[PDB]
Design a protein around this ligand. Structure first.
Ligand SMILES: Nc1nc2c(ncn2[C@@H]2O[C@H](COP(=O)(O)OP(=O)(O)NP(=O)(O)O)[C@@H](O)[C@H]2O)c(=O)[nH]1
Ligand SMILES: Nc1nc2c(ncn2[C@@H]2O[C@H](COP(=O)(O)OP(=O)(O)NP(=O)(O)O)[C@@H](O)[C@H]2O)c(=O)[nH]1
Ligand SMILES: [Mg+2]
Ligand SMILES: [Mg+2]
Lengths: 166, 133, 133, 166
């Protein structure tokens, strides 16, 4: 099978680990355990192709910012995650887009914009503003809930599709 | 479940997607012979001069349509000189279920070559793995 | 076994071969804090709508010189929501012995950070792996 | 660690599997079970470097000759094995050297000449003739016994050395 190197990035607490663990283990992590950097290997079937996903779940906390160049070099596609009830996380997205573009020296690195925690009622980031940002970058926008599992497969599978069409 | 002519056509299709010396061959009354690969992923207890050493191997075997999972397991344990209780081991097919690739334990009475033929040559679709409980 | 100033120099050497936010830090009377990675290679029994699904993960942890193997095991089982008996699991160091890379079971009373410091940053020299018996 | 793709080739019955299994499992296979094609993964330390050896143990029987192009394309170094009590196996060595050279399109593919079964008294291939052949090719000659373990590590480790110096 072909292998895909996926990296999950975004501000601390947006649900990067929760999304990853929903894909890997098929359950929701309620606990908030800040990540330093974790990696996963998951075999999947996407549109009839068997794929090995190597998934890097990264730190949103600033103390680990120095690790970014390293993982941005090696990653093939990026899930750029914010939480729809956290305006600051949405503001932080462009910073990730820009650092990836710098490190990889490309303006079309495979990326998906993910608005997570869509199970929550108290939304502060309007879907239209997120759709606008994704359109600006030329990338897909998907809302997910690591809790309900809504959009989780679509987010990762869309990213793999973005990579294999690149 | 299935027709012999069905098996004949299945073998011909299989063989078009495979090298000649690795193809299946039709025999008497819908029996056939052919090849499988089994991935052994075992931890072997070792003594120094506790500790284990990995056995990570893919063994290619020539078998028939009547060769059972039980026969495949015993043959591998003997070939790799594994002395543990054979009933501590199981053969799994790695297959697609629900967008997920899962490992399903095989019945000791199952026929791996039949599974191989039905799946086609691609190990991405079906692979066999031998594991200790 | 060893000197505190020995530990101090060992930490400085360690850190020169590692990124800054991933370095070790000296604390009171020769204690220290630092990072390890544990490779979880587990088979998880699953139900469809028998079968297992792999959990293949490398978890990076911030721990101290007094953190025990017992603590590392329990913390991982809880983090990955593994409900099996914790005494069915063991932590191994993958190390060089006799030109061979072998896995050696750790005592539940051992201190992984100490092992990590002594080995240096290179996971080729020493890696940790969590396995079910 | 860095990975090395090793391929073990030579006439049927020379001890290709026995040599491989001595390295992998640290024991001697007395049984003669002709190989179709088997593969092994073994982590080792060679001169202080940790290496992953992917070892392909190939068929000496002519019926599987069609599989050679495929494994010669993918292999990085070749242990070319004959048995010192089998003159025909020694004559067959040049055929392997030539097919590898053809398939890889190179006259310096990493190779080691291995004279196996050196535990046996009834020798029919003189060591001098084998030394002469290896000198002709510009490769090392090592005598091994899969039975006693004599030379087994040196053969594989020499091959890895040949690859990393290439
Ligand atoms: N309601 C809801 N909560 C979620 C969702 N995703 C994550 N959370 C919750 O948000 C908290 C933080 O999630 P976590 O996955 O740890 O975030 P992170 O982005 O990995 N954090 P860090 O960057 O520090 O590693 C947890 O308490 C988690 O249960 C979601 O889709 N819905
Ligand atoms: N005395 C002795 N016997 C050996 C040695 N190496 C292999 N043999 C014996 O020679 C026979 C054939 O060995 P085997 O490893 O199967 O050879 P092969 O080259 O792999 N055969 P094939 O090409 O058909 O797969 C066995 O009976 C084995 O025990 C050796 O170093 N010394
Ligand atoms: Mg996280
Ligand atoms: Mg053989």
């Amino acid at each position: 099978m072909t292998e895909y190197k996926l990296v999950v990035v975004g501000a601390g607490g947006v649900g990067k680990s929760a999304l990853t663990i929903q894909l890997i283990q098929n359950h929701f992590v309620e606990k908030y355990d800040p990540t330093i950097e974790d990696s996963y290997r998951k075999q999947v079937v996407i549109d009839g192709e068997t794929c090995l996903l190597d998934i890097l779940d990264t730190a949103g906390q600033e103390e680990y910012s120095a690790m970014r160049d390293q993982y941005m070099r090696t990653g093939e596609g990026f899930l750029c995650v914010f939480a729809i009830n956290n305006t600051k996380s949405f503001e932080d997205i462009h910073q990730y887009r820009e650092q990836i573009k710098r490190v990889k020296d490309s303006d079309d690195v495979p990326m998906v914009l993910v608005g997570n925690k869509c199970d929550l009622a108290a939304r502060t980031v309007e879907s239209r503003q997120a759709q606008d940002l994704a359109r600006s970058y030329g990338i897909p926008y998907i809302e997910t809930s690591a809790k309900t599992r809504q959009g989780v497969e679509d987010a990762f599978y869309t990213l793999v599709r973005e990579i294999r069409q690149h | 479940p299935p027709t012999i002519q069905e098996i004949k056509q299945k073998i011909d299709s299989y063989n078009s997607r495979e090298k000649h010396c690795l193809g299946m061959k039709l025999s008497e009354d819908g029996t056939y012979t052919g090849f499988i690969k089994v991935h052994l992923k075992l931890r072997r207890p070792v003594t120094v001069p506790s500790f284990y050493l990995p056995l990570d191997a893919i063994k290619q075997m020539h078998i028939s349509s009547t060769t059972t999972v039980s026969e495949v397991i015993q043959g591998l344990l003997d070939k790799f000189m594994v002395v543990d209780n054979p009933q501590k081991f199981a053969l799994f097919k790695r297959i697609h279920k629900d967008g997920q690739v899962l490992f399903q334990k095989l019945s000791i009475a199952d026929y791996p070559l039949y599974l191989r033929l039905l799946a086609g040559p691609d190990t991405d679709v079906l692979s066999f793995v031998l594991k200790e409980n």
